[PDB]
Design a protein around this ligand. Structure first.
Ligand SMILES: NC(=O)c1ccc[n+]([C@@H]2O[C@H](COP(=O)([O-])OP(=O)(O)OC[C@H]3O[C@@H](n4cnc5c(N)ncnc54)[C@H](OP(=O)(O)O)[C@@H]3O)[C@@H](O)[C@H]2O)c1
Ligand SMILES: NC(=O)c1ccc[n+]([C@@H]2O[C@H](COP(=O)([O-])OP(=O)(O)OC[C@H]3O[C@@H](n4cnc5c(N)ncnc54)[C@H](OP(=O)(O)O)[C@@H]3O)[C@@H](O)[C@H]2O)c1
Lengths: 316, 313
């Protein structure tokens, strides 16, 4: 008798949302024994080699003594790094072509919202004002993308194909057809000097927290507009409000915030130059994500291969 | 006291390696990394030696005269630096031609000698010999008959393959069937069992190998892309691999490099991913070529032949 391995589903989602996930995972991984952490006895916990996680309680993972690796269901991993790094087990984030497709679409959709003056036209409508605003071509309009990763590079390609003059920024050098790529801290402020619409798709780390502070925001040309699809703490909220109120930044589309759901007292809900979205730019698709987890687990069972994991020292 | 700026986004170790080779080939010249020059020293630069430079750095060399790339491919230089109107000199090097012609034959053999099928059998613990047919019975097509493409067609010819080549204007290559013009591409592709791409990326070659052109290849044809990623429609390629119409693809070049982790190419059973290594620039030979060009400029004022921006390659 040699106990076979099992999988713990470890989340702090609602019971309904966790059940939805369970069904999708069970269908994608039909040969596997997958159970909610709370359903396992102490002896069953010792049989777990893989945890599938969604905002897991880190104390639960510490009670899986033979855990080998961890699969998250989200692209962002800053809290996993902070809370689970000490267990020294590989953390596999979600990398999914469908997530990339969806985010790249979002990036273009909300770049268009800003570019085509949709907020100004909405304000005019409320005022019963009929007034056409001047148009300038995308080829004359510089769009900057911060982050050229699974999501950021995909976004730069959609924005390129829409005809924008696209500049991208990342930590290490990239080559992206039809996109001007910049790398390193040393080139950021120069890049920003040129950017009329700025899209943020960075991960949150010690190095990106507060990147878009008063100084960096002041690098943007007058009337520049910003889209934050990354994490709230990358963009200094106080500095953003000052820049909006001084007329130096024209508008901000914010999908991510320090506290979610955004508290009712936030000035962002009522600011005339802010568009609030409830963290929906690129929602995980449970079908495609489950099939990816499924393939990763199958490959592990077949060959011992653990998928690419987060470098803790890098932080993403 | 003119000086030379070395402008790259290579690693510090690779750029230092290059700097040593250039310093040896150009002993009388003051060559420094762009990041080491003060604003005043930047004003003394008349020549930039470049390898994936940030274009904004070149825009800060106000008395720049001309630019020498260390790479054969120039499409980003054209797009990003064309506006400065300084001559762009691409790398043409017999050793680069030799290396790429070698790569073309090496990876043609990888396909021809069934190396992927044998690797799949090995993973399955299956012992099974596959039928062999002579190279003289296998048609190989080369897209691009330039510095690299013609050299590749000659190596393939000499290995005994039945070689067809395609370019914009007519060529005569002994022992090779040469086709020219858009009008002859689809007819050529109809005959090709292994297709090697050695075109430059331009407005005219982007998306050349789309669903329609890929459908011209005979069933089971195999492809080698050593040109640029955008020349080959990725979605169309995957559909052709999955339908069984294309047998295998060796891909060295992609629209985004490094290839994103989400790319279907990494995991596809009928795809071999190479990290843009088919023909790396040889720092010794390329340095001696840059050296001779700079020396001739210092001696006579001659700027070497440069890229025609309207032509795009
Ligand atoms: N709002 C939503 O609905 C939503 C949904 C999903 C994800 N997200 C967010 O999107 C982020 C990106 O996801 P992803 O999968 O694209 O991540 P990823 O593949 O790791 O890419 C991250 C990119 O950011 C760059 N970067 C990181 N630190 C940097 C620094 N200090 N300086 C300059 N560039 C730096 C990286 O540079 P290198 O390439 O050189 O490593 C890389 O290009 C997530 O972390 C998450 O916060 C939001
Ligand atoms: N993967 C790697 O490591 C690597 C390394 C080096 C180079 N490369 C790639 O290899 C490419 C070729 O280099 P090269 O030195 O051979 O260039 P080249 O000497 O300029 O030759 C280019 C060839 O392509 C043909 N061509 C260009 N546009 C065409 C079109 N629209 N239709 C048909 N034929 C067309 C040219 O026709 P004509 O003869 O009529 O002018 C010529 O035969 C580079 O641009 C680079 O992208 C890749």
């Amino acid at each position: 008798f040699q106990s076979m391995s099992r999988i713990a589903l470890v989340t702090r989602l609602s019971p309904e949302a966790e059940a939805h996930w369970a069904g999708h995972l069970a269908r994608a991984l039909p040969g596997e024994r997958i159970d909610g952490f709370r359903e396992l006895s102490p002896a069953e916990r010792a049989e777990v080699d893989i945890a599938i996680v969604a905002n897991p309680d880190p104390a639960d993972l510490a009670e899986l003594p033979n855990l080998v690796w961890i699969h998250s269901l989200w692209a962002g991993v800053e809290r996993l790094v902070a809370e689970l790094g000490h267990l020294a087990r590989p953390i596999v984030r979600l990398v999914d072509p469908e997530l990339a497709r969806t985010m790249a679409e979002a990036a273009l959709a909300w770049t268009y919202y800003l570019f085509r003056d949709m907020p100004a036209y909405a304000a005019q409508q409320r005022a019963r004002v009929w007034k056409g605003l001047p148009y300038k071509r995308p080829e004359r309009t510089t769009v900057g993308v911060l982050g050229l990763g699974e999501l950021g590079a995909a976004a730069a390609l959609r924005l390129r194909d829409a005809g924008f003059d696209v500049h991208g920024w990342s930590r290490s050098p990239k080559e992206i057809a039809g996109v001007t790529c910049h790398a390193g801290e040393e080139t950021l402020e120069r890049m920003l000097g040129q950017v009329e619409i700025l899209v943020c798709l960075l991960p949150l780390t010690g190095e990106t927290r507060g990147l878009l502070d008063a100084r960096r925001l002041a690098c943007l040309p007058e009337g520049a507009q910003i889209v934050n699809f990354a994490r709230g703490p990358i963009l200094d909220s106080a500095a953003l409000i000052e820049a909006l109120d001084s007329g130096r930044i024209g508008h901000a589309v914010l999908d991510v915030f320090e506290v979610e759901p955004l508290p009712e007292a936030s000035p962002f809900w009522g600011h005339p130059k802010v568009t609030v979205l409830p963290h929906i730019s690129a929602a995980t698709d449970p079908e495609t994500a489950s099939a990816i987890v499924g393939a990763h687990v199958a490959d592990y069972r077949a060959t011992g291969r653990i998928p690419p994991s987060v470098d803790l020292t890098r932080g993403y």
